[PDB]
Design a protein around this ligand. Structure first.
Ligand SMILES: O=c1cc[nH]c(=O)[nH]1
Ligand code: SF4
Length: 206
């Protein structure tokens, strides 16, 4: 059942976000500071979904406000997409993490498929509330949430996909997670950034 009994019968994003603050659909709510719901409005035509809030998001209450968010903002700007017009959220709403000794931050840990499926009712409610024309899946966890646990982002870059069990049958575009472009060889990061821009443009051109 997961988060299902915690999701209210409302499409109002403010009411949904407040209810998510109360969610116990999996165990992640316990150590996290708060739930991080999506940001944006129901008029948005483009919904973007990441994996989970990170250290900064857990305390800001907003998605994509750390380094990965800054890289995403650079990609959106290059793609001529206004972040204010998007609805941005994550597959899981509570930060899953650990700390390492000497660490400079809390380290995100990958949600289990079990936690993703537990939290999915929130994603469904968000999609029902926003009725996006296109959904950008940033990274493996988000893409698998809607396209299946076996889905490989690397094999379907910037392809326009459509599956039958998604609300409103929006177009789906799976792409690299912005966090992946933060580190690595310069030429590899630059090529990967260009591909993210391409994928965002495909989505915006739906
Ligand atoms: O909101 C956020 C921030 C970092 N990484 C994610 O997947 N989502
Ligand atoms: S991660 Fe999702 S399902 Fe789990 S407690 Fe948080 S909001 Fe509920």
């Amino acid at each position: 059942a997961g988060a299902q009994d915690f999701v209210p019968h409302t499409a109002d994003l403010a009411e949904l976000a407040a209810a998510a603050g109360e969610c116990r659909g999996c165990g992640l709510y316990r150590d996290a500071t708060q739930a991080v719901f999506g940001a944006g409005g129901r008029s948005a035509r483009i919904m973007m979904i990441g994996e989970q809030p990170g250290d900064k998001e857990d305390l800001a209450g907003l998605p994509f406000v750390g380094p990965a968010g800054r890289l995403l903002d650079r990609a959106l700007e290059a793609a001529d997409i206004d972040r204010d017009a998007l609805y941005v959220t994550n597959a899981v709403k509570h930060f899953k993490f650990t700390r390492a000794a000497g660490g400079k931050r809390r380290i995100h840990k990958t949600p289990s498929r079990t936690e993703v499926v537990a939290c999915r009712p929130w994603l469904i409610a968000e999609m029902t509330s926003v009725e996006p024309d296109v959904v950008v899946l940033l990274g493996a966890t988000a893409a698998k949430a809607l396209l299946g646990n076996d889905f490989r982002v690397t094999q379907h870059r910037g392809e326009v996909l459509h599956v039958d069990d998604v609300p409103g049958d929006p177009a789906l575009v799976a792409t690299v997670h912005p966090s992946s472009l933060l580190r690595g060889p310069k030429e590899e990061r630059e090529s990967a950034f260009a591909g993210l821009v391409d994928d965002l443009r495909v989505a915006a051109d739906v």
